[PDB]
Amino acid sequence: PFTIDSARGIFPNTLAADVVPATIARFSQLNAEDQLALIWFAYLEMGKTLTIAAPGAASMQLAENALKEIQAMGPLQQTQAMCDLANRADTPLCRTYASWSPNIKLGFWYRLGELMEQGFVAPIPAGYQLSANANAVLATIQGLESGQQITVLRNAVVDMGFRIAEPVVPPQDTASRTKVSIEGVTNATVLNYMDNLNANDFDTLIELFTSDGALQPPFQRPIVGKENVLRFFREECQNLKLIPERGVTEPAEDGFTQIKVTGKVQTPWFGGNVGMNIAWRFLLNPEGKIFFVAIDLLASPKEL
Ligand SMILES: CC1=C(/C=C/C(C)=C/C=C/C(C)=C/C=C/C=C(C)/C=C/C=C(C)/C=C/C2=C(C)C(=O)CCC2(C)C)C(C)(C)C[C@H](O)C1
Numbered sequence: 001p002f003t004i005d006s007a008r009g010i011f012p013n014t015l016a017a018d019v020v021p022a023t024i025a026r027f028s029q030l031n032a033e034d035q036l037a038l039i040w041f042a043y044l045e046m047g048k049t050l051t052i053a054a055p056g057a058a059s060m061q062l063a064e065n066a067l068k069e070i071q072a073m074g075p076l077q078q079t080q081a082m083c084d085l086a087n088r089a090d091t092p093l094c095r096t097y098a099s100w101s102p103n104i105k106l107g108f109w110y111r112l113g114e115l116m117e118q119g120f121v122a123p124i125p126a127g128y129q130l131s132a133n134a135n136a137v138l139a140t141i142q143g144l145e146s147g148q149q150i151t152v153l154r155n156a157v158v159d160m161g162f163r164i165a166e167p168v169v170p171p172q173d174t175a176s177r178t179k180v181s182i183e184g185v186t187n188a189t190v191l192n193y194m195d196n197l198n199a200n201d202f203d204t205l206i207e208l209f210t211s212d213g214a215l216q217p218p219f220q221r222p223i224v225g226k227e228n229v230l231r232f233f234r235e236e237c238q239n240l241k242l243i244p245e246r247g248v249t250e251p252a253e254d255g256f257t258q259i260k261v262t263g264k265v266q267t268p269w270f271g272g273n274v275g276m277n278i279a280w281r282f283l284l285n286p287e288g289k290i291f292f293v294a295i296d297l298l299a300s301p302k303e304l
Contacts, residue, residue, distance in 0.1 A: 001253060004214045004222050007283045007292035010252070011260045014279050015299040019144065020151050021219045026137045027156055032086040033079075034134040037124045039156060042141055043113060046149065053269050055107030058166045063108040066096055071115065075122035082112070085160040097161035101235045104164060105157050106269070147276035150269070151218065151297060165235040172199035182261055185247035189288045190259055190280075194242050202233040209290045216294040218278075239268040244280070245304065255286035262304045277301055 027035060055063075070081050070093070084091050097105060115121035130138060141152055180194045189208055196205040206226050209215075214222035215229045223232050244263035252258040259282040264275040277298040283291050298304065 002256065002283070002291060004212075004224055004292055007214075008216065008222065008294065010258050010283055010292075010294075011279075011281050014260065014281065014296055015303050016218070016279075016296045017148050017151075017299045018219070019140070019299070020148050020155070020297060023137060023140050023144075023152050024155050024159070026133070026140070027152070028159065030134045030137065031131060032083040033128075034131050035086045035156070036082055037128050038130060038134050038138050039153065040113075040116070040124045041130075041138060042149070042153065045142070046146075050146065050270060050273055052110060053271065055103070055110050056166060059104050059107040060111070062100070062104050062164055062166070063111070066093060067108060067111055069093070070112070071121060078122040088160065088162050090162045094160075094162035099164050100161075101163070101165035102154065102158045103166055103236070105160070106154065109157055145277075145300070146274045147297065150267070150274055151276070155219070163235070166238070168202070168234050169200050169238050171201035171203075180242065180244050182244045182263075183246040185244075185249060185259060185261060187249060187257070187259055187282075187284070187288075189284055189290060190247070190261065190282060193280075193282075193290065193293070194244055197233075197237065197240060198242050200238055202230060202237070205233060206230045210285060213289065213291045214293075215290075216292070218295055218297040222292070222294075241266040242278075243275075252283060256291070257284045257288075258282065259284065262298070277304055279303065 027038070030038065070078055073081065081093055084094055085097060088094065097108070112121055116123045141149055144152070177195065177199045180191060182190065193205065193208055206229060209226055209229060211226060212224065214224040215232065216222040223229050242263070242265050244261045247259055247261035249257065249259050261280040263278060265278045266272055266275060277300070279296040279298055281294040281296065285291050
């Protein structure tokens with residue numbers, strides 16, 4: 001009776017920060033140069049209090065040829081290439097960009113941001129004024145908590161263009177692994193999920209899932225089956241820090257158990273400087289395997 005798509009409804013009182021997809025949808029309506037200017041503005045102002053971590057060396061190497069090609073272009077053509085990405089135009093650059101994992105896309109724009117600051121890539125025109133709709137989108141972004149701001153910016157970047165990923169880091173040494181503690185939750189599957197993800201131990205992590213089980217990242221559709229979920233762990237889930245705090249455990253239909261945990265997560269892009277408020281919603285089968293886990297970005301503290 002449980003389907004993945006029906007399991008999406010467990011713990012319906014959980015208020016997700018759906019202002020994030022709402023804002024992305026508004027952003028996606030904008031003129032391309034407005035999109036690019038808006039992120040430049042948001043990025044400049046955010047950088048006054050938050051520092052982005054440098055892209056990894058492997059990621060920089062993978063994006064290097066594309067970056068070099070843009071830098072060699074004349075200023076008008078550099079701007080056109082960036083507009084192509086924002087417009088999701090079909091071009092060789094846009095197809096290369098689309099083959100990249102999120103971290104490589106993010107590191108590509110990190111470097112273009114440095115080069116625009118230095119004047120070596122064509123900057124946003126001086127004195128540029130955003131459109132009416134764009135100004136309102138930027139205002140909305142600047143009113144969000146930092147965890148929601150960086151999620152808007154990430155999703156905007158990942159949406160550009162029209163599989164290349166970083167190498168997979170070896171799992172953390174067993175002796176140096178730390179274990180989480182969750183108020184009210186001693187469920188071994190949940191604790192093993194948190195601890196193995198915190199150790200980048202994706203091969204152990206995936207064995208917690210049913211063959212047909214699914215993982216639903218914030219504001220995304222469920223990723224279904226062990227092959228696809230493992231691919232997602234390896235491409236996108238390295239070096240996270242999960243800090244679960246508290247939870248609740250309840251029976252579900254057919255001998256299943258449903259568990260909701262709240263806490264914080266840190267991305268390696270910002271470390272301890274941005275703590276995202278997160279809920280995990282687990283649906284476990286009678287053997288304790290993960291049939292479904294959703295990860296939600298919460299609308300505020302006071303969803304924790
Ligand atoms: C795009 C662009 C520019 C550059 C923009 C840049 C450099 C933006 C960079 C933004 C970054 C680095 C954002 C990073 C965001 C990271 C986030 C939101 C990570 C969140 C991860 C989470 C919530 C992980 C949760 C997970 C948990 C807890 C699990 O249990 C399972 C795995 C999963 C991943 C779901 C500039 C150059 C500034 C201007 C130009 O005109 C346009």
